[PDB]
Amino acid sequence: HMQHITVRLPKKARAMIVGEITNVFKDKYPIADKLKVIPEYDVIEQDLCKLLSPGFPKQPLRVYKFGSRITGIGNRSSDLDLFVDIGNTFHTFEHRASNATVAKLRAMRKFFCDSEDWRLINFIEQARVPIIKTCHLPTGIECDICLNSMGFCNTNLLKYIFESQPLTQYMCIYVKNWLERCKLTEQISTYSITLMVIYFLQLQALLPPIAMLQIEDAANQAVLVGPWVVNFAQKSFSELGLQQLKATVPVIKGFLRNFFAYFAKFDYEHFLVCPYIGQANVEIAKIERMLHARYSAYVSDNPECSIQLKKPMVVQDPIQLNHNVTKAVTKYGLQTFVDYCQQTAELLEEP
């Protein structure tokens, strides 16, 4: 659509970008760090167990917290994501929820509804990942409750990445806020652009390929959720041979300029963002042959569950390798993102 005219960067974004990088982080980073762990979360998880256990007597029940609060890029308005594991379902993968999973979520709904400690906000059973959205009234924190473990698994990977290489965390706080000010979150999520930051830094030799953390040998076995390897070697970057930078304003600004310039000129027709492989120029035409043998076997028995590559923008989840997290980005949404990237890189320059 008017592909010959650049989509103008929104003024709400422009003001943030041309304003000092300091003001971006002065409050936001300390807040995000603090929100990795606060006692409110223990209250939420204790209340969730007490609420739901009677509904599932004799089954084990464990609560796993995840999402932006837990990884260190949240703010006070952020939700908290919770995987409720009833009956040791952690290692079970369902690309689309099973009838059994849906029946469980439907049963859980009335508990939040009847309970005075919880306000039911929405019940979403048609999504790829069905969720219950509910406010925990004693803390006021909005919670997304799901029934599979993949988000928790990628949260733990992000936490390792952010703690090892804090530049990654600063960059993700910045680009999260940039997406919001650009009004792009309908199309590109915080998690998607987090994977884009990770991939970009892998290309700079500042983060390992995820595949390199998941070598399967005598010393290292996989934790499998269905066909997906969800654990990783928690090696020091010293051992990996990767330098660990101190995030300063000038360091952050230079890496952000290069991030936006890179994705402004990325060839989305032929290549995908691929933190699994962590190397430059990963071809859409080749990725499905570059994955572990479990992927090929999984698609054989689930032929409609292969990664969706016939899409404008391909960003592959590094653990759930059949998931293009940007599969809903349209041609015009991608043009908009590219144009906003181009204009942001321009405003971060300083000859």
From Swiss-Prot:
One of its GO terms (cellular component) is cytoplasm. Its EC number is 2.7.7.52. It is found in: Cytoplasm. No activity with Mn(2+) or Ca(2+). Residues 256-323 form the PAP-associated domain. Its main location: cytoplasm. Disruption phenotype: Viable. Fertility is significantly reduced. It catalyses: RNA(n) + UTP = RNA(n)-3'-uridine ribonucleotide + diphosphate. GO terms for molecular function: ATP binding; metal ion binding; RNA uridylyltransferase activity. Signal peptide: none annotated. Its cofactor is Mg(2+). Mg(2+) binds at D79, D81. Uridylyltransferase which mediates terminal uridylation of miRNAs, leading to their degradation. Has high specificity for splicing-derived miRNAs (mirtrons) and other miRNA substrates containing a 3'-G terminal nucleotide. Appears to be a major suppressor of mirtron biogenesis. This is Terminal uridylyltransferase Tailor. It comes from Drosophila melanogaster. The gene is Tailor. The chain holds residues 202 to 550 of 560 of the full protein.
